[PDB]
Design a protein around this ligand. Structure first.
Ligand SMILES: Nc1ncnc2c1ncn2[C@@H]1O[C@H](COP(=O)(O)OP(=O)(O)O)[C@@H](O)[C@H]1O
Ligand SMILES: [Mg+2]
Length: 148
């Protein structure tokens, strides 16, 4: 392929993972699409809870789709495990956070921010952001300048 830009974090506890998600949500825009990958127990739900908190959402954060409009931006959290018409959400005006998105690769927009959470060694996690498209390179650049 061509080159992709990435950010990579290491987190040693779920609060650090939530903090990264909170930072990311602060700079999301309509209609961003974030895919969220990682093995069972890696921390995708944990990430998603922190993302919702970063949008100012105060409730749950699986039912294929679930929607939140109480924040600064609507959040369409999806868990496509297992296996349409998702296109209205992807081109909506909120943020789509798509867990296990690779199970519906054929339906995804070409551009997205791919988030992968991997277990590394101890109880630790490595979270990689991969920008696919100029919008998501700009998002990652904003996150890097505002690294708390
Ligand atoms: N650095 C970390 N980031 C996220 N979760 C962590 C971390 N370290 C330990 N955990 C624990 O791993 C589990 C992740 O659960 P969950 O987010 O539901 O995983 P998934 O949604 O990927 O199946 C939780 O018990 C969480 O507290
Ligand atoms: Mg999950």
């Amino acid at each position: 392929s061509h080159m992709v830009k990435q950010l990579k974090w290491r987190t040693v506890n779920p609060e650090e993972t939530k903090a990264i998600a909170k930072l990311t949500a602060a700079f999301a825009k309509p209609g961003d699409v974030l895919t969220l990958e990682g093995d069972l127990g890696a921390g995708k739900t944990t990430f998603t809870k922190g993302f919702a908190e970063g949008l100012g959402i105060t409730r749950i954060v699986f039912t294929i789709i679930k929607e939140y409009n109480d924040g600064v931006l609507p959040l369409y959290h999806m868990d496509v495990y297992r296996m349409l018409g998702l296109d209205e959400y992807f081109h909506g005006q909120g943020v789509c956070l798509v867990e296990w998105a690779h199970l519906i690769e054929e339906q995804l927009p070409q551009e997205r921010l791919q988030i992968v959470i991997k277990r590394a060694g101890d109880d630790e996690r490595e979270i990689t952001f991969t920008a696919v498209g100029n919008r998501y390179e700009m998002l990652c650049e904003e996150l890097s300048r505002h690294d708390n």
